[PDB]
Structures are given as structure tokens and as C-alpha cells.
Symmetry: C6
Subunit: 212 residues, 6 copies
């Protein structure tokens, strides 16, 4: 993070060892389940590009995913260089924190019109983590179907946990929650849900189908 | 949370990783048992809408419940937009922290007459968590009955833990504690309780029925 | 708790998540063993009524006990209303933190002559926790008796752990420590203790009876 | 502890929940092994009598020992009252924190000539914990003897761990370390030790007898 | 680390016990897997040479590796002495924190033109940890080959985890990711990958080969 | 530690309970393996003699070692008294923190020419811990020999972990690393090592002998 020193100048605060241990535990245990993106944004809230790189580089496992992340960051950095022909003006590799010093990063982040290289880079990281979260999804929403004995609440949990990983825009997810959620319910359950009509909320669907 | 910087301006404090881990543990382990509402209010005490969204989005399981929560927040945000036709005046989606920046959220929360979008949104969240807590209750108070060998204290614990989840107003809960608590006691126990008359406190009921 | 802001005004400090987790662990594990009262007073040291309510409401189990606590607090609040007919003058429900805002609570607690609603309410809570601790005692001091093979130290531990829960005033507890402690010792042990005469301290009793 | 407020007046700091949990763990697990006295002095370093009472009252087990502690504190408080016939002048029960408010305790501890009631009371507590540590010693130093197959280092560990609990003054402990340590060694080992003569240090004794 | 005292002079902050326990856990558990270098740089962010030596000296196991580290630091210190013939000008052993006091180290690190002996020494340490990480790699990238039944994602994880340890420059690693990654895939998988042509990204390779 | 109060005077900071628990865990678990000396110096970084005594006195086990430590400190204190015939001038027992108050210790440590009794005493402690670490070494370097099937890396780890405990000066340790390390290698391994000649570094030795 960045903290102002008592001497009246902008200074780095090192990302806490407790925060790094929390992030490493998150990635190693949850294995790019979609709640990894909000944990990244939460743990990384004030991060410089050096702090962001520290979070990525300390992940030990999943080096296939962490490579997909690096090469996503490289194409985002390339598009930045294309959009911004040449404090310095930061190149994409400066925002990615590879060709810039910590003092340049703080210089940009605290400039009079701030150039928020920590936020820009955290966007490119979250774009890469999105791609990874989609790829690590073990199944796709059209293949989520309710078992003949399965509680509708457990099927709904599976459906929406899969729908978090799915790529499509909110208009398509709206269509999925309207149509697929009913269509993939089991034969007894689906009758209950159809009897509600198309406007049923998820609360109405679950409470109507509770204990079917 | 919000904290004033030493430079004399309002600034964000990121929700602590320890607080996020505590909240995620609460939701994942206690699975919307009613003590989740007070743990939410306790852990979320100073939260901006960005902090509130961070707490909701980091929950990994229970995505059926977390969807019921989101669509509750959306209808609360819609009613806000209806009640408040158009710093900006915050739209419901601004209070829900989706269409507003963190700097707008802090701007409202620290305005000279403060517009407390963190508190307003935390109300809408607690309304959704209430609906979820009721739905995740495995049984209803009229079906809580004492076993013929069950200690009256364990039945009272089951009864009042169920009565926390129940929807009804305090006048109805008063009626439930007066009538159902006696009526659903086992045949030996119920005689002891009836002998106290209708005015008995819960201490009087439990101490009279101890070791029946 | 209450903390003065750097801007020169009284402000809330939220009860720490670590303190809440510690209190919840205390209540859930120790199940109103008498050391719950001092842990409450220790963890709750600076608490406003909102903080006190947060501590009570986050307990998940023991909802029979937590109901006995609420209805104790209600009768204490009723006696306060009776003793104090009508910053505002706080009603009993204001001190219990149900009809008062956090800003009213801090207003009273930091008034020029402070009205210490956090301390008053913590007294009513400890009165209720006392009643609960007595009721959750599995046995009573006149039924604590030493086994023929049991070490006198283990019997003394059982006796005084029971004597903590017992209701009676210190004059009665003095009589209990003088008479019952000897009278309920096992037949070999009781001879050793009687040989000391009535003035023996607990150290003298235990050291004389060690390894009997 | 005591901390000066930013408003320029002496104020209480509540004993940390982590410190209380550490003390309770110490007492419950180590069961008045002699390292409990230094852990008490370490955890209690700045304590007021209210903090000291909080540490004692939160111990759940060992209520025989905690009673011996209370009645030791009472006789120390009685001797204080005898030595000091009557801010107020603190009575022994004021120093024990039972008849004094926290504001009186801080008033004495921060008086212009400070009256250090926290240190005085911590002395009386450590006197009681000493008596308890001696009584909870499972054996006495004259009964610590080396087994015929036992390593001299393990016997030395047993001997000095017992010698910590023993009551006697340093002159007597010096005699014990000189004479009993050799005299109670096993028959082969004792020959090795006798060959060193009476002036041998414990390092010389252990290194000479290593691997006997 | 270094922190300015409130008296207006540069002062040491001791490396936290939590940070030391975290580093010792990292080295002892992860056993110079390549994520040890970023954990070192993360935990050591503000370190003086005394703090760096404290991190190295507290490692208990792996004393073969920690000797390779010391003798790497010695040759780096020798090259520094060669490059810099003779506050003092720091000798290599001063930068390694062996012949310099903590007050000299802080004197250099806070000099008007700062001489950043903590950063210089942390470079020499990371050079030694690199050599160790390469040597502790159980296999080399040309020997990483996919099993006939092994998922391509697990092979990619093994390949890139090995490629982290490998010595070669980024141009050689680029060649390895282009050619060896395909060449060492199993016979069915390798056909899928070859069908993409040479320009395929790792995302394209993994998504094309998913569930082969 | 020592911290300046906001009132402008030097004051004690109590050694943290987390630091004491960390030290007690270190000593009890690692049992004077040589990494105990750097953990002591790390955890004790700012310690007064009272803090140092608190660290020693809270160790529960190993009372043979802790006695060797005390009597080492006593002879160091005696040599100090001999070297320094008589704020006061501190006697050796004042530096050992037994005959001095905490306010005398802080008085010396913050004197205008500081008399650093905490550092002096920490030296005497580390001298005693060295003697203990040597004595608790289960074997000596001339008896460390490689098994016929044992990996050379595991033998090197055993050798250098033993060489940490060994008493001798760096010139003798240099001779040991040059000659004994080869001489005590197993018959196949020793041929590989001899083929390198006498100038081989430990990296060269281990990499040449890897997988023998």
C-alpha cells in the first residue's frame, strides 16, 4: 500500500505477511473457485504494482494458471502501449511493475493528477483471473442438471455457483436464470416450478419447491 | 470503513483480511443460522457499500442464498429509486455500490448533512439475510415438540432457536412463548408447567421443570 | 467502545471481531460455567449498549439461557423506568440499547456529568448471567460429597467450583466453607480435617490431608 | 494497564482478550507448574487491581487453588491494614481492588507521589501463587532420585524443576544443589560425580556424566 | 526495518516475531520451492542487514542450503570489495552485516545520498537463494513429460513449476514454452496441440486440450 | 523494550505475550538446537534485563539447561564486577537485572552516554545459550559419517547442522569443512568429491555428487 510518512512525503507500506499468507491460502485451497476474484480485490485494496506482483509471485501451485495470468497481463500491457504511445508516461511494463521502480510507482500513484498504476494493473490481473476462473470451472451451466432425488436448494447452489464462472453478459445470465434453471430441474420439481409461471423470483421458486 | 487522513481529508480504510476471513468462516460454517445477522452487523460496523459488497462477494458456498440476497437488494434498490426520483443524489444502484465509485460513497457518507449510504445498504442486506435465515430454518415453531425423554432445557433451546428464525412480529412471538411453549411440551412436563399458571417466566418454567 | 476522534469529538470504536470470536467461543464452549461472568466483564470493558447487544446477539446456542437473559434485562429496564420517571433522560429500553441510537448512547456516556448507560446495562446483563450460571449448575453444594477413594484436592475443586455458582451471600458461603467442606469429606479424610479444629485455613486443610 | 489519553489525563487500558486467553491457557494447561509465576508477572506487567482481579477471576478450573489464593490475598490485605492504620489512604481491600473503584485505583497509581496499588497487589498475588506452586508440586527434592538406567540430564531436569517449587532460601537451595544432587544420583553416575570433587559446576557434572 | 522516532531521528524497528515465524515456516515447509524467493522479498521488504541475517540464521533445517547461501554471500561480498576499493565506505562484510553495527547500517541506509546496504545485501541473498532453488529442483525441464493418462493441465502445472526453477534467460524459456511444452506432451494430446500451429497461447493450448 | 512516552520521558514497553509464547514454544519444541540463539536475539531485540529475565524464567522444561544458563550468567556477572570496581555504576547483578529496578535499568539504557545493560546482559545470556547448545548436540562432527545409501545432501545437512553446534573458531571450522566433509563421505561418494580437488565449493560438491 501507500502511506504518508510523518516527515510529509509519500511512502510504501509493505503488504502484511498476514495478508500474503491469507492470499496464498485462498489460491492454494480454493483453486480459482470464483470467490478468488473478490478475495483478490479485498486483500489487494491499496496495492502498488510491486504489491500486486508480490501477491502473484508467492503462489506456489497452479503454475499453469499463473502462466495464463502472466501472458494475459502481457497482452493487456501491449494494448496499453498501443493505446498510449510515448514523471514518465508509464509503459505497460511499468504498470505491470516489471520495468518500473517502487519509487516510480508511488510517484505515479501520488501525482497531482494521479496516474493510478496500481488500479490499472489490478484490472489487468482481474481480467486474467476471470479467464482462469472460467477455465477451472469443472462443468458448464447447460450441463448442470438436478438429480431425481436431489434437493432443489442443492441444485440451485450448483447452478448459481456455475453461473458465477460463466462468461456471458448479464442479459444472457438473466436468460439462463429464467429458462435453464427451470428446464434443468428434475421431473417432479420442474412441475412445481412451471406452476409458478415465468415471473417467479428465486425465493418463490425455492420456497414453493422446498421439501418436494 | 472510513478514516480521516492526517492530511485532513476523509479516506477509505480497507476491510481487514482478518474481518473477511471471520465473515467467510461465519457464513460457510453457520450456514445462515440466525446468529449470522448479528455477526454481519458486528463485522460490518463502519462499512462503505464497497466493503459490504466485498463481504457478500467473498462468500463461496450458498450461491442460492447469495442470489436471493442480490435480488432482494435489487428490489430494495428499486423501491429506493421509486421513493427518491432524481454530490449527486444517490440512485438505489449507487447505494448498493454497483454504479458508484468508492469516492462517491465516501463523499455521501461524509457530506455535511451525511447521506449514510453504508447504513442504508446494510439495512437492505439485513432484510435479505432475514429472508434467507427464515428459509434456511429446517423446521417451524408449531412443529417443535418435546420428546418424551428429552430435557425441558434442550426443548427450550430448540424452541427459542427456532423462534429466532420465525417471521412474525413480537406480539405473535409473545403469544408463541406463552401458549406454544407449554402446549408442545411432553405429557409429564406439560403438567408441571400448567401447574404454574399462565404468568410463569421462562426462569420459573425451567427451574420448576428441571430434572422432570 | 468509545474513542475520541482526532477532530476533537467522541466517536464509537467497533467491538473487535477477535473480541466477538473470543466471547462466542467462551459462551459456546464453557456453557455458563461461572468463569463466564468475569470473561464477559473483561471482554466488555468499554462497551456501549450497542456493543453489549452485539455480544449477546452473536451467541448462537443456548437460546433458552439467552431468553432468560433478555427477560431479566426487561425486568431490570422496567425497574429503571419505575425508579426514574420521565440529552434525553434515558428510559430503561434506551439503556438496554433497543430504543436508543448509538449517537444517543455515546451522548449519554460522554455527557459532562456522564450518564454511564454502558455500565448500567452491563450490570443488568451480569444480573441475568448470574441467574443463568446458577441454573446451569449441574448440582448443589449440599450434594457435593467426596468419594471414598477421591483425592481431597479434587473434592475441594468440585466444592469451590460449585460454591461459585451458589446464590447465597458471603456470610452463608463462609458457613458453607467452614461446615459443609468438612462435613461432606469422606470418612478417612474427615477425621484428618476434624483433628485440625474449626479454625483451619484451606491451605492447612489441603496440606494436612494431602495423600490421605 | 494505564495509558494517558490524548486529552491529557490518565485513563485505563483494558487488559487485552489475547492476554486473558493466554493467561487462562497458562493456568489451565500448566496447572501451577512454577513457570506460572513468571508468566503471571509477564502478562500482568502494567495491571491495575481491576486487571489483576480479571486475571484471577477468569480461571475456570483449580478452584481449590484459586480459593487458597483469595484467602492468601485476604491475610496480606489484613496485614496491610494493620501496618497502615487509617486521594484516600488505600485500605488492604482497596489494594485488592474489591472496595475501590477503577478511578480510585488509577488515582493512586498516577498520584504525584505514586501509591502503586497494582504492584502491591501483584506482590500479594505472587505470594499466594508461590504457596500454591509449592503445594501442587507432586514430590519433594529429597525424594527426587535417579533411576539406574536414567540419563543424568533427565535426572538433573527433574531435580531442578522440583527445586524451583521448593520453599527454602537460596542458602538452603545452594546446599541442596551441592549435596543432594550428588547424593541422589544412581550408583554408577554418583561415582563419576564424586570423582570431580565438591567444587564442580553443573556444566562440569553434566558433561563429565554425559553418556554414562 | 527502519522507522523515524518521534524525537526526530532514524531508528530500528525489530523484525516482527510473526514475520520470523512466517519465514521459518516458509523455508522449513516449502523447502526451497521457487515461491521461497518471492516470500523472502515480501517478508524482508524494509530489512536492514541485521534483519536479513536474523531471517537467515533462524532457519533450523537445510543447513547444506544455508551454507551454500553463506558462501554465495561471501563471494558477492568479495566482488563488492573488488569493485569498491576503500560514514565509512561499507566493505562487503559491512553490507553482509557481519562487520557493521546496526547503527552503521541505519547510518548508511538513511544517509543524505542513501547507501542502501539492506537492498544490496538482499540482492546477494536472492542470488544465493536462486542457486539453491535450482539445485533443490528434483527434475529438469527436458525430463518433464506427460503421462499417457495424465490431464494436460496437470502436466502444464508440472512443466511451469519446473520452468520457474530453471536457470536459463527468458529467450531460452520462451523457446522452452514454445517447443518443449508440445514436444513432451503425450501422444494423443500432442496431436491436439500440433493442430493449433506454433502461435497458440497457453490458454488456447489448455482449452483445446481440456478433457482429451 | 523501551519506548518514549508522549509526555516526553523514557518508559518501559512490556514484552508482548505473543513474543513470550513464541519464545517458550521455541525453547520447548526446538530443545536448544542451534537456531535457538538467533531466535533469542530476534525476539529479544530491544529487551531490558527485566525483559530478558522474563524470557528465561518463563521456560518451563529444560531446568538443567536453565540452571547452566543462570550459573553462566553469575560467572559473567562476577567477571564484570572484577573488571568494574565500584545513576549508579551497575554491578554485575544489576546488569543481570536481579539487584536493579526496572527504573534503574531504563535509567542506564537511556543515559546521555548510554550504559546498555540490556545488550550487555543479552551477551551473557547468549554465552550461556552457546554452552547449552554445544552440550545438547547429540553427536560431534568427527562422528558424522555418511551412510552407504544416504544422499550426499542429507549427509551435508547433518554435517553442517552439527558444525553449527561445534565450539571451534572459524579457522578450525574451515579446516573441518575442507577435510572432514570429504573424509567422512561414503566410499562411492568420496571418490566423486576427491575428483574435484581441494578447492571445490559446497555447491560444486553437492551438484557433482547429486544422485550418486
Amino acid at each position: 500500500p501507500i502511506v504518508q510518512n510523518l516527515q510529509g512525503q509519500m511512502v510504501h507500506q509493505a503488504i502484511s505477511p498476514r495478508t500474503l499468507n491469507a492470499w496464498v491460502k485462498v489460491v492454494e485451497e480454493k483453486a480459482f473457485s470464483p470467490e478468488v476474484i473478490p478475495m483478490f480485490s479485498a486483500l489487494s485494496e491499496g496495492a502498488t504494482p510491486q504489491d500486486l506482483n508480490t501477491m502473484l509471485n508467492t503462489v506456489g501451485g497452479h503454475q499453469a494458471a499463473m502462466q495464463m495470468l502472466k501472458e494475459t497481463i502481457n497482452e493487456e500491457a501491449a494494448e496499453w502501449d498501443r493505446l498510449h504511445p510515448v514523471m514518465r508516461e508509464p509503459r505497460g511494463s511499468d504498470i505491470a511493475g516489471t520495468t518500473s521502480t517502487l519509487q516510480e510507482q508511488i510517484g505515479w500513484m501520488t501525482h497531482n493528477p494521479p496516474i493510478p498504476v496500481g488500479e490499472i494493473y489490478k484490472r489487468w490481473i482481474i481480467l486474467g483471473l476471470n479467464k482462469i476462473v472460467r477455465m477451472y470451472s469443472p462443468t458448464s451451466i447447460l450441463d448442470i442438471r438436478q438429480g431425481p432425488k436431489e434437493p432443489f436448494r442443492d441444485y440451485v447452489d450448483r447452478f448459481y455457483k456455475t453461473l458465477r464462472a460463466e462468461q456471458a453478459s448479464q442479459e444472457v445470465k438473466n436468460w439462463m436464470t429464467e429458462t435453464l434453471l427451470v428446464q434443468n430441474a428434475n421431473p417432479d420439481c420442474k412441475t412445481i416450478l412451471k406452476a409458478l409461471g415465468p415471473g417467479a423470483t428465486l425465493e418463490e421458486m425455492m420456497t414453493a419447491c422446498q421439501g418436494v
